[PDB]
Write an enzyme that holds these catalytic residues in place. Structure first.
Site, mmCIF file in Angstrom:
data_model
loop_
_atom_site.group_PDB
_atom_site.id
_atom_site.type_symbol
_atom_site.label_atom_id
_atom_site.label_comp_id
_atom_site.label_asym_id
_atom_site.label_seq_id
_atom_site.Cartn_x
_atom_site.Cartn_y
_atom_site.Cartn_z
ATOM 1 N N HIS A 32 -20.061 -39.647 -18.033
ATOM 2 C CA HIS A 32 -19.980 -38.569 -17.150
ATOM 3 C C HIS A 32 -19.595 -37.953 -16.683
ATOM 4 O O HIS A 32 -19.740 -36.676 -15.942
ATOM 5 C CB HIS A 32 -21.000 -39.032 -16.542
ATOM 6 C CG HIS A 32 -20.885 -40.000 -15.170
ATOM 7 N ND1 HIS A 32 -20.294 -41.394 -14.922
ATOM 8 C CD2 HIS A 32 -19.862 -39.941 -14.274
ATOM 9 C CE1 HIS A 32 -20.204 -41.217 -13.876
ATOM 10 N NE2 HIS A 32 -19.566 -40.719 -13.589
ATOM 11 N N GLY A 63 -16.989 -39.003 -6.369
ATOM 12 C CA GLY A 63 -15.179 -39.292 -6.528
ATOM 13 C C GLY A 63 -14.799 -40.817 -7.151
ATOM 14 O O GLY A 63 -13.902 -41.011 -7.388
ATOM 15 N N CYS A 100 -16.197 -43.127 -9.339
ATOM 16 C CA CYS A 100 -16.051 -43.223 -10.822
ATOM 17 C C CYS A 100 -14.811 -43.468 -11.457
ATOM 18 O O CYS A 100 -14.135 -43.325 -10.620
ATOM 19 C CB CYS A 100 -17.174 -42.321 -11.595
ATOM 20 S SG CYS A 100 -18.405 -41.889 -10.303
HETATM 21 C C1 LIG Z 1 -27.092 -40.766 -9.804
HETATM 22 O O1 LIG Z 1 -25.923 -40.782 -10.428
HETATM 23 C C2 LIG Z 1 -25.043 -40.466 -11.279
HETATM 24 C C3 LIG Z 1 -26.034 -41.014 -12.340
HETATM 25 C C4 LIG Z 1 -25.656 -42.028 -13.679
HETATM 26 C C5 LIG Z 1 -24.492 -41.012 -13.449
HETATM 27 C C6 LIG Z 1 -23.401 -40.984 -12.932
HETATM 28 C C7 LIG Z 1 -24.191 -40.497 -11.838
HETATM 29 O O2 LIG Z 1 -23.401 -40.227 -10.494
HETATM 30 C C8 LIG Z 1 -21.740 -39.545 -10.824
HETATM 31 C C9 LIG Z 1 -21.443 -39.870 -9.666
HETATM 32 N N1 LIG Z 1 -21.173 -40.647 -8.530
HETATM 33 C C10 LIG Z 1 -20.234 -41.096 -7.618
HETATM 34 O O3 LIG Z 1 -19.805 -39.848 -7.373
HETATM 35 C C11 LIG Z 1 -21.140 -41.811 -6.813
HETATM 36 C C12 LIG Z 1 -20.742 -42.928 -6.870
HETATM 37 C C13 LIG Z 1 -21.025 -44.111 -5.910
HETATM 38 O O4 LIG Z 1 -21.366 -45.618 -6.445
HETATM 39 N N2 LIG Z 1 -21.616 -43.943 -5.147
HETATM 40 C C14 LIG Z 1 -21.771 -42.496 -4.359
HETATM 41 C C15 LIG Z 1 -22.099 -42.219 -3.009
HETATM 42 C C16 LIG Z 1 -22.146 -40.873 -3.021
HETATM 43 F F1 LIG Z 1 -23.040 -40.834 -1.822
HETATM 44 C C17 LIG Z 1 -22.070 -39.928 -3.690
HETATM 45 C C18 LIG Z 1 -22.237 -40.298 -5.419
HETATM 46 C C19 LIG Z 1 -21.253 -41.430 -5.835
#
Ligand SMILES: COc1ccccc1OCCNC(=O)c1cc(=O)[nH]c2cc(F)ccc12
Ligand SMILES: COc1ccccc1OCCNC(=O)c1cc(=O)[nH]c2cc(F)ccc12
EC number: 3.4.19.12
Lengths: 304, 304
Positions: free
Chosen positions: B41, B143, B145
């Protein structure tokens, strides 16, 4: 989202761990620059630990008696000295893996990561707090002595603890890196009173803010309190008295959530008086006090 | 003595973390030999994440679009490929810090350490379990991921998890290192049902043995039970059914304490039926299921 008892990445500390043997005893040492720091009880035998005369035991030792091994390589010992309850073994080679570092004396209530080690090899890492009574509730077995506690800011490791012993009560005691014990403990195999411990109130409040940030808010109520009223409850439940300095440190968390510090105190008051009623907060069925306000903001902001 | 939620020392994994940027998105990558692994992603934009066509998005990308930075040095990308939900970026330099490693697919109920990372830099380390429903209850922000889960045996790191997303429920989902998701999750910003979770019974029993080894024994009773009777209680309390394979894995802990597995099941049965009555076990006010029998023996023996 989510909240975990997160330890600092142990990499910079792993590269400092060595094994120190003197006679029949082996424990862990910390190799920083051309010095290896370890607990002075490495020079004791079983008959000695009941009341060791460390000055006398050290006089029988020479540089060649301290065997220091970093993984598979042997370090050459060119000097030895006792500072408080630690031994400083000067070696002829500076550790190439020495990170930027400081030696700090933490305050009770503050947290740090411990890298448990055996025979100079890291086994695991965990986060803990220095209890208000200067003990730590660690996880340490035979040979864990010399394992250290530390905090990491950017690229600088601040070492705050070296492990020395387990009290008959199963709690742990140790020194700062200048060999001064935290609390009234002595490096002797004797009954040692760890005084009355208290719960770290500022940390519990910081953890309640972490719960709100993460969505656990069932405990929020329609009440407020004062420092005076709250402290009467804190007294009854063996909680540390909350001061304006503690309120000030909770400022940023109060700002982020918009929940006034005294309002969060009133939630804590109701939880102390009524319990959790079989519910949980951040996966815990009790009030957690091992996260400082700094820890909460760090974990909730992603500081690397 | 003492029992802590201990993570593996993260050193060997820290030396593998890199930053991967593609367009406007930055996340973490794992540099092993001449390959960098990261969630696919990283090639998506906000408008894409609702239902991305990864084959099509990747076709618009060239090697020079994947910016990979290891600390302060830039890696040259000479190949890219998508395997399941991971991208493999072949680089022209093998990571000099590559430890001995394996890619493994863990079973639900097993544990591992997570090294949370942001912009390719390690922030913290924690131990967790893969839930029976294939989610993890982690601590991850924007961030995070590409941060990975791993176990360490001697000098070999077995990577078992790469972080991909947080479900609307605040729980975490990810893949093995071949990019296959654990559970039914897809890398799409959509409502995704994480089915019914259960408590890991074998781990709770292992933790009860750890409690006995450490001196917490108030919960031990005069009763015994059978696998059939215990499983009726397990069913009622959403606990995983206990099998003879689970009893067999508890063998060494049963031998060490001399407490028969079915007798420990009867203690667990009484705790499920009566609760803790305001008491604690190993500092917890609930039944802990994030320690496997292997974890308990490791922590209680000092494996480095
Ligand atoms: C719904 O998002 C996706 C769905 C499928 C695939 C990827 C998706 O996101 C990619 C980005 N994700 C992050 O950076 C993220 C990961 C996490 O575990 N906690 C978070 C807490 C937050 F407040 C904001 C972001 C995150
Ligand atoms: C009473 O012992 C000392 C007193 C003062 C100073 C030193 C003392 O011991 C030196 C050795 N200690 C250990 O290796 C030790 C440390 C620990 O935290 N847990 C343990 C658990 C065990 F079952 C056995 C040993 C330990």
């Amino acid at each position: 989202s989510g909240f975990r008892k997160m330890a600092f990445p142990s990499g910079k500390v792993e590269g400092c761990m060595v094994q120190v043997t003197c006679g029949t005893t082996t424990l862990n040492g910390l190799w920083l620059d051309d010095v290896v720091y370890c607990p002075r009880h490495v020079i004791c035998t079983s008959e000695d630990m009941l009341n060791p005369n460390y000055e006398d035991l050290l006089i029988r030792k020479s540089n060649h008696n301290f065997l220091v091994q970093a993984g598979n390589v042997q370090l050459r010992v060119i000097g030895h000295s006792m500072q408080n309850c630690v031994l400083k073994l000067k070696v002829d080679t500076a550790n190439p893996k020495t990170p930027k570092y400081k030696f700090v004396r933490i305050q009770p209530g503050q947290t740090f990561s411990v890298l448990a080690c055996y025979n100079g090899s890291p086994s695991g890492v965990y986060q803990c707090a220095m209890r208000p009574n200067f003990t730590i509730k660690g996880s340490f077995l035979n040979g864990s002595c010399g394992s250290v506690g530390f905090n990491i800011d950017y690229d600088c490791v601040s070492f705050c603890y070296m492990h020395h012993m387990e009290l008959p009560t199963g709690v742990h005691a140790g020194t700062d890196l200048e060999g001064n014990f935290y609390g009234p403990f002595v490096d002797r195999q004797t009954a040692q009173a760890a005084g009355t411990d208290t719960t770290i109130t500022v940390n519990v409040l910081a953890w309640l803010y972490a719960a709100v940030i993460n969505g656990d808010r069932w405990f929020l109520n329609r009440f407020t309190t004062t420092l005076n009223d709250f402290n009467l409850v804190a007294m009854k439940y063996n909680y540390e008295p909350l001061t304006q300095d503690h309120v000030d440190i909770l400022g940023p968390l109060s700002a982020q959530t918009g929940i006034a510090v005294l309002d969060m105190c009133a939630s804590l008051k109701e939880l102390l008086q009524n319990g959790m009623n079989g519910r949980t907060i951040l996966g815990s069925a009790l009030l957690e006090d091992e996260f400082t306000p700094f820890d909460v903001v760090r974990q909730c902001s992603g500081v690397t």
